Amino acid sequence: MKRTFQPSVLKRNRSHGFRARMATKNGRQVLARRRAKGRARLTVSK
Amino acid sequence: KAKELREKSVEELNTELLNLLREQFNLRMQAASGQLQQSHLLKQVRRDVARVKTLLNEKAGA
C-alpha cells in the first residue's frame, strides 16, 4: 500500500526547517523550548 | 623566544615566520610519509608561529 511518509528533503526543510521556524514568532518559541530541554538536534535541518 | 623576537623588526619577524612556515611544510610532508621520527617538532613550530604572530600584532597596530 502507499504509506503516509513519502520523503522529500526540500519539502521537509521548507515545512519544518530552521528558517521556516525562525520566520514566525511561534516557530521561534519552538526553538526556545528545544534549547531549554537541551535537544541535540534542534531542528530537522542537516 | 619572546625576548629574542622582541628585539627584531617587523620585516625580520615576517621573514622568520616565512622560514618557519617552510619548515612546517617540510615537516608535514616528512611526517606524511613515515620519515619523520621526531613528532615534537610540529608542536614546537606551531607554538613558535603563534609567538611570531603575537609579536607582530604587538609591534604593529600596538
Binding site: - | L17, L18, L21, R22, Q24, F25, R28, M29, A32, S33
Partner: protein
C-alpha cells in the same frame, strides 16, 4: 599573486595508493591530499612554486568521511579533498 603562506597551508600530504602509483608511472600524475577549501589554482601555484615543477592540469574530488564505531559508540571521520595533479612530460618528482 597567491600568497606563499596560503600556498604553504594548501597541501597536506601525498596519497599512497595502487591507483596513485599507476597514475604516477603511466600518466605522470601525482595524487595529493589537500586542504578542503583549496582550489585548483591554489594547488597549481603551490606545486609550481614549492616543488618548482610544471603542472599541466589539476582535477579535484572531495572524499566523504566514513562512519566508524569505536567499541559501541558511533563516530564519523572527516571529509577530505583529493587532487590529481598531472605533471608535464619530462618533469620528475621524488
Amino acid at each position: 599573486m597567491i600568497r606563499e603562506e596560503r600556498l604553504l597551508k594548501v597541501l597536506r600530504a601525498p596519497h599512497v595508493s595502487e591507483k596513485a602509483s599507476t597514475a604516477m608511472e603511466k600518466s605522470n600524475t601525482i595524487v595529493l591530499k589537500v586542504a578542503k577549501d583549496a582550489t585548483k589554482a591554489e594547488i597549481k601555484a603551490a606545486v609550481q612554486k614549492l616543488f618548482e615543477v610544471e603542472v599541466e592540469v589539476v582535477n579535484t574530488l572531495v572524499v566523504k568521511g566514513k562512519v566508524k564505531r569505536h567499541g559501541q559508540r558511533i563516530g564519523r571521520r572527516s571529509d577530505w579533498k583529493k587532487a590529481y595533479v598531472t605533471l608535464k612530460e619530462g618533469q620528475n618528482l621524488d
